Amino acid sequence: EETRKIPVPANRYTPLKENWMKIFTPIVEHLGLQIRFNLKSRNVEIRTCKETKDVSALTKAADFVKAFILGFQVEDALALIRLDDLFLESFEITDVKPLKGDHLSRAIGRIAGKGGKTKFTIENVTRTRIVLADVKVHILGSFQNIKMARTAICNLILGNPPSKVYGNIRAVASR
Amino acid sequence: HRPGPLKQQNKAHKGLSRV
Structure with missing residues (x-):
């Protein structure tokens, strides 16, 4: 299993709440990765599962949510995946x-x-x-x-x- | 031609004896 943790600042929690759908749906559908949001440690947690191919997508997936942590718009980070x-x-x-x-x-x-x-x-x-x-x-x-x-x-x-x-x-x- | 508001122009700094 491969683990990625992405930190979230205190001001980014509300846009993460308002944009969570377009964050997990691109990952869970065509990237085949498991994602969750640890509220106790405040980290976007990404790990692999039995249905993942092209393992580098994981890396891009991390960069995906990293862009939304840095302030970028959602569809730009979708283009980062594509x-x-x-x-x-x-x-x-x-x-x-x-x-x-x-x-x-x-x-x-x-x-x-x-x-x-x-x-x-x-x-x-x-x-x-x-x-x-x-x-x-x-x-x-x-x-x-x-x-x-x-x-x-x-x-x-x-x-x-x-x-x-x-x-x-x-x-x-x-x- | 007269430049518009978008054109950058800075305000000048004003600094014998009688015998």
């Missing part, structure tokens, strides 16, 4: 420049943009999914798309305006 080369890379905003106080919140606002649209635009440029924590940034996609999204984000918080990075990333996506 596709074969999808990865997530995370870094804090202060991991590339020392920002304090109101500067850090301004960096958060520059990543998100007004209405979220700037972040949304970068997604539609790079075919990736970007989730902002309080200070951490998580990018889900393939390797080169992760690199383009990470370069766009690192330019956005360097001080470059969202319009300039917007135009540059919308032009450089034709390669």
